[PDB]
């Protein structure tokens, strides 16, 4: 019944620049010495959590010097001197004093990196899926920020709705990128029956939208 | 070097009970705390329980009715039965290891080691096993230098599938995206990989798709 809510919910920070994660509980987390039954965990994109602070301050094994808790009582703030690529993913706060065990909203730590552009490739469906019966038209976005983007699919240059599926890789925890895969699938007849089909995408990056087409069909 | 593997019930049907096991190599159960903290959009980040070498044990309230932890410190694993999994039950499932120092009382130093994470999905859907399709490479492809090939995981249940290329000796440029859930109730996936458009031709690439829950593993090829 300790409820714990995090200030920040999704905080972009630029390379080199400072972020500070705050945590609060409902309670005291505080202890007759003076410590606080504070611990903050941060989950990579894609991997299981990890422990950067407990007991409030106290650095864990191989975090950085950068990784700093600090607070006490109700209120605690966690504080990224020079945030990089590496520190991105979200961050928890967990209360361990009163048995509840509860930890906090989750905080996303987004690099704010250059802008930069799609590197747009389509493809066209296999041999093997026409003869399954169905046929899936893939484009991909490569390595561009920021995340926002539209994947426009045109066959026979008019626009389609409701048969297309998007997936977005998280931030590359190198050069902070991300990836875009967007799936045309409609029945083999279908596809028989319209000649081209192109993938349009926006994004800041570019000056104008940028369309990659194949014309078999 | 402590490695903490995780298996048991990926998929479960409404009602049924879950299985999670840890094993733990490298050291000794005796002397730490092991939980299983759990991980969904609904139910966010969530403490089940902990356990003790002894085998005493803490719970939350909530899942105290339907949960049973055990141990064994003569196998070096521990688990985590949950009883009448409902659509809130499906979620990541991780194991940890606490870390703990007795100074007049059993201060905690946080969770040192954490597991893989198992996936365990409520649904009675049937266990389908994945289509393997490749997206090769071509002038569409092809953007200069850099030529995109892909693998399409197209449709499966439940969730888990893992995909190398080169049998793991391909990690340069490859990118595996999120599956996306269709509307046949079935998964889709891609994982792509971008390389020199010299290479295209000369070497040999190939994506291996493993879906455990269908047991099925398939080795494709891409070819320009």
């Known amino acids: 019944d300790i409820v714990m809510t995090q200030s920040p919910l999704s905080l972009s920070v630029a390379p080199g620049e400072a972020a500070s994660i705050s945590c609060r509980s409902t309670?005291?987390?505080?202890?007759?010495?003076?410590?606080?039954?504070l611990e903050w965990y941060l989950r990579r994109p894609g991997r299981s959590p990890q422990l950067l602070i407990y007991?409030?301050?106290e650095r864990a094994l191989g975090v950085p010097d950068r990784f700093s808790g600090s607070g006490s009582g109700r209120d605690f703030t966690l504080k990224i001197s020079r945030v990089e690529a590496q520190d991105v993913g979200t961050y928890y706060c967990?209360?361990?004093?009163?048995?509840?065990?509860?930890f906090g909203q989750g905080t996303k730590l987004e690099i704010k990196r250059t802008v930069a552009a799609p590197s747009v490739f389509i493809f066209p469906p296999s041999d093997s899926q026409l003869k399954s019966g169905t046929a899936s038209v893939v484009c991909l976005l490569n390595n561009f920020y920021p995340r926002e983007a539209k994947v426009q699919w045109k066959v026979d240059n008019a626009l389609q709705s409701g048969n297309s599926q998007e997936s977005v890789t998280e931030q590359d925890s190198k050069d902070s990128t991300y990836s875009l895969s967007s799936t045309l699938t409609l029945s083999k007849a279908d596809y028989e029956k319209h000649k081209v089909y192109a993938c349009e995408v926006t994004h800041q990056g570019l000056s104008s939208p940028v369309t990659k087409s194949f014309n078999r069909g | 070097q402590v490695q903490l593997q995780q298996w048991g019930t990926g998929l479960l049907k409404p009602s049924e009970t879950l299985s999670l096991t840890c094993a733990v190599y490298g050291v000794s159960l005796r002397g730490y705390y092991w939980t299983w903290i759990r991980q969904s959009p609904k139910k966010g980040l969530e403490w089940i329980g902990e356990?003790?070498?002894?085998?005493?044990?803490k719970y939350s309230q909530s899942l105290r009715s339907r949960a049973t932890l055990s141990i064994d410190t003569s196998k070096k694993q521990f688990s985590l039965r949950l009883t009448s999994v409902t659509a809130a039950d499906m979620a990541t499932y991780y194991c940890?290891?606490?870390?703990?120092?007795?100074?007049?009382?059993?201060?905690?130093?946080?969770?040192?080691?954490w597991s893989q994470g198992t996936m365990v999905t409520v649904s009675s859907a049937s266990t389908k096993g994945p289509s393997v399709f490749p997206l090769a490479p071509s002038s569409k492809s092809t953007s200069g230098g850099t030529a995109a090939l892909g693998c399409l995981v197209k449709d499966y249940f439940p969730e888990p599938v893992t995909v190398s290329w080169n049998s793991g000796a391909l990690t340069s440029g490859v990118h595996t995206f999120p599956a996306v859930l269709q509307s046949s109730g079935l998964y889709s996936l891609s994982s792509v990989v971008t390389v020199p458009s010299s290479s295209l031709g000369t070497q040999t690439y190939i994506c291996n798709v493993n879906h455990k829950p269908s047991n099925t593993k398939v080795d494709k090829k891409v070819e320009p």
């Open positions: 940890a290891r606490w870390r703990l120092m007795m100074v007049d009382e059993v201060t905690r130093h946080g969770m040192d080691v």
């Open positions: 007991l409030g301050s």
């Open positions: 309670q005291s987390l505080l202890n007759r010495n003076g410590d606080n039954y």
């Open positions: 356990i003790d070498e002894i085998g005493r044990t």
């Open positions: 967990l209360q361990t004093r009163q048995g509840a065990f509860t």
